[PDB]
């Protein structure tokens, strides 16, 4: 029995978010939170909120025990990109991709 | 006991009860075929043909007339706009060796 939470279109590059996602994938939910709290990355707080949302969903909507949960799936998908243009020398303009991410956490009992 | 028989343009080592694919024979499914060109007989009593074993034959049963799995022949010549694509399915006769009459 799985509980899922998703933060869609978070303004954080998928590559950057994925660095943090790899730390918590497969970990027990209690440990995962302590890893996010002590990992100094932009994604940590974002992913932590998604993980806590999933735990709440597991506990509330499915009467699962929060202490027995494990992160069975954790991945970051690419969201739509905001395209921007920085002025460079000689009148040239260069593109800037303000990327977004879809952060998904699935928890389940071990 | 096994025998070496020439059929098609080729030779096959056969034992009784074995199922062999050979070049297409003029024979319907179910019919009994005979192979008169037996070159060698093995097993206990060893006959050596010179080139054939005199009088020896192998009877067998046509199981199926079919065509092999398709191969796509594609050839080209670089830079000379020359392509050629051609399908091939080689006919065969599936045969079950009944008796080796050495």
């Amino acid at each position: 029995m799985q509980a899922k939470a998703v933060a869609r279109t978070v303004r954080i590059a998928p590559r950057k978010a994925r660095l943090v996602m790899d730390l918590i994938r497969g970990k027990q939910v209690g440990e995962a939170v302590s890893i996010l709290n002590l990992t100094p990355r932009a994604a940590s707080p974002i992913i932590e909120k998604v993980l806590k949302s999933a735990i709440a969903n597991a506990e509330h909507n499915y009467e699962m025990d929060a202490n027995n949960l494990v992160i069975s799936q954790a991945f970051v998908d690419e969201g739509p990109t905001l395209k921007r243009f920085r002025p460079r020398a000689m009148g040239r303009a260069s593109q800037i991709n303000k990327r977004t991410s879809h952060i998904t956490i699935v928890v389940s009992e071990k | 006991m096994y025998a070496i028989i020439k059929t098609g343009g080729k030779q096959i080592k056969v034992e009784e009860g074995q199922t062999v694919y050979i070049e297409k024979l003029a024979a319907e499914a179910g019919e009994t075929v005979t192979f008169e060109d037996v070159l060698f007989v093995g097993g206990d009593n060893v006959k050596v043909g010179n080139p054939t074993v005199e009088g020896a034959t192998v009877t067998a049963k046509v199981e199926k007339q079919g065509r092999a799995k398709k191969i796509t022949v594609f050839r080209y010549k670089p830079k000379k706009n020359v392509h050629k694509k051609q399908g091939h399915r080689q006919p065969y006769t599936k045969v079950t060796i009944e008796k080796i009459n050495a």
Binding site: - | V46, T52, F74
Partner: protein, 118 residues
Amino acid sequence: PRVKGGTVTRKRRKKVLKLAKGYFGSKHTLYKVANQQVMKSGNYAFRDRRQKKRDFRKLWITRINAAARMNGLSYSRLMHGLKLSGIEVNRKMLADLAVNDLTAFNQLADAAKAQLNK
């Protein structure tokens, strides 16, 4: 009437990509390099269907020579002996005997040996 590109282009290219399954990296993913490799594979497959018949004959001759020299004959003389005795067993079958029924092979080898000593 206007003829839209439609679905014909995608259908044709997908067929090629399916033939390129298992190719490395882009060669199973991108049509142009996939298309090149499938074309190249065609030439190779043709060439090798003709090379197959040489490789197996090469293998059979090597095996016959090994088995022949276990009977104190080189492959050259063994084959000459068989021809003089009128034996039409081919190298595929001789190699098979050498591997699967060595006693049978020795009988043929002895036949050849008789002819050579004549």
